[PDB]
Design a protein around this ligand. Structure first.
Ligand SMILES: COc1cc2ncnc(N[C@H](C)c3ccccc3)c2cc1OC
Length: 466
């Protein structure tokens, strides 16, 4: 039909085949459900209208179905559009040295070529702006992008080229505040600079919670949405593709296991009650700071196999502290209902519980297929990627909430360098912790033995009041 005859032939251009039930399906601007990578590229650079939601979602999630080098190749191929031949009358005009009318040729340039080409430059611009890490990770990808952008011709295009170049140069330069005064840094037994004595009971619990909240706030803010798409952090190139997400997970493992280690390696019962009570006070200060992540790390250490079973320890923990722990536990019950309302009801700044996003992303990744099948043809399941992208969007809404708290560089380093496992792998460390729990508090038929004190300093806490 007339509309399809004015588009380029399939023998000269791959992005103009007619839409069909076996190359694209959909759920204002229509919402793409699934499609071939070629039909996804066509709609990413659609001539009829701009589509900021699809562009944003595509560039966050495309790595789960297309490599960066392949995407750049596809948008460059999209950009090189063949022009139609002159009409018979215009061929005669050209043959006589005269100017052709070129009525359809001019219509095709203005209504299809120029919009698609600007749509391609818009993808390039959004790509360099929001996902510059693709270019930092692949210097050759950036070389290709700059060669492409640098050889575009025309005045309306050179302005787009300049704004794309401006972002690229700003991103390269980038790689090579508090309204109120922050509260005074709290000290307890350990003195500033005496890093050799830093420990759970020697540092002030207020300061432990404040420095862990700064650390976790920074780890939470550094996570980029694409590190969470397609379970790439659990796959071969995880270190390159999910460096910030892996640091976030490693910190929670290390901190959680260090709390467990602090507890079960305190073999004396009265000393272990002081350790458990101190971790609960740390949790209370995380609650005051709206560090839900920290609260649920403490809940996770208290609920772990080696700690949860310590009946004699928890028996000496005051009811008030047991009630705080129970209420913190109940943040997680009923698919995190209390937590979700508390996250929305509190005033910023805060650190959301990161684990819930990973759980929801993994359920979406496992619960939906990679492709949809329509008339024997496989189509990329794009709605699956959009659902994952919507969860990463929830992560991003809390990533601009800095804390009015002073960094204590030695305490920061102390928590950044937690290494409870040492040369052990996680399984043999958790097996060791559990066996240590059986040693300090044997199962009921066996009696409770006594163990000598390991701490020379006082056990009384300075409390959670500044
Ligand atoms: C049925 O399983 C549970 C129910 C719980 N209900 C309430 N609080 C819990 N944990 C908090 C952190 C806590 C409270 C006091 C002492 C030790 C830990 C629960 C933990 C559970 O199992 C892992």
């Amino acid at each position: 039909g007339e509309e399809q005859m004015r588009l380029p032939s399939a023998d000269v251009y791959r992005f103009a085949e007619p839409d069909s039930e076996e190359n694209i399906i959909f759920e204002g601007i229509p919402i793409i459900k699934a499609g071939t990578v070629i039909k996804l590229i066509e709609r990413l650079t659609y001539h009829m209208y701009a589509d900021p939601n699809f562009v944003r979602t595509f560039l966050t999630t495309y790595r789960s179905f297309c490599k960066p080098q392949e995407l750049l190749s596809l948008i460059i191929e999209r950009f090189e559009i063949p022009e139609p031949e002159p009409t018979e009358a215009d061929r005669i005009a050209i043959e006589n040295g005269d100017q052709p009318l070129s009525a359809e040729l001019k219509r095709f340039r203005k209504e299809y070529i120029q919009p698609v080409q600007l749509r391609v430059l818009n993808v390039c611009r959004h790509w360099v702006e929001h996902h510059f890490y693709d270019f930092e990770r692949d210097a050759y990808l950036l070389q290709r992008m700059e060669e492409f952008i640098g050889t575009v011709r025309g005045k309306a295009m050179k302005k787009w080229v300049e704004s794309i170049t401006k972002i690229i140069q700003r991103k390269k330069i980038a790689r090579d505040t508090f309204q109120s005064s922050p509260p005074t840094v709290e000290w307890h037994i350990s003195r500033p600079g005496h890093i050799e004595t830093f420990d759970l009971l020697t540092l002030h619990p207020i300061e432990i919670a404040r420095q862990l909240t700064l650390l976790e706030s920074d780890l939470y803010r550094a996570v980029q949405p694409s590190e969470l798409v397609g379970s790439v952090w659990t796959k071969e190139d995880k270190e390159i593709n999910s460096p910030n997400l892996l640091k976030m997970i490693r910190h929670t493992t290390n901190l959680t296991l260090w709390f467990e280690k602090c507890i079960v390696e305190t073999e004396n019962l009265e000393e272990r009650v002081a350790v458990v009570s101190r971790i609960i006070e740390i949790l209370q200060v995380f609650q005051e700071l709206n560090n839900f992540n920290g609260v649920l790390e403490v809940v996770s250490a208290m609920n772990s196999s080696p700690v949860y079973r310590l009946d004699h320890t928890f028996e000496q923990i005051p009811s008030r502290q047991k009630k705080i722990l129970e209420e913190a536990h109940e943040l997680s019950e009923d698919h995190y209902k209390k937590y979700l309302a508390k996250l929305r009801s509190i005033n910023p700044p805060c650190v959301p519980f990161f684990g819930i996003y990973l759980t929801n992303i993994l359920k979406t990744e496992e619960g939906n297929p990679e492709v949809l099948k329509r008339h024997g043809k496989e189509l990329i399941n794009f709605s699956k990627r959009r659902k994952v992208a919507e969860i990463t969007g929830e992560i991003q809404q809390y990533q601009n909430q800095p804390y009015c708290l002073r960094v204590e560089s030695d305490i920061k380093r102390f928590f950044e360098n937690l290494n409870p496992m040492g040369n052990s792998m996680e399984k043999e460390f958790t097996d060791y912790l559990f066996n240590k729990s059986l040693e300090i508090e044997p199962r009921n038929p066996k009696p409770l033995p006594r163990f000598p004190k390991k701490y020379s300093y006082p056990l009384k806490s300075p409390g959670v009041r500044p």
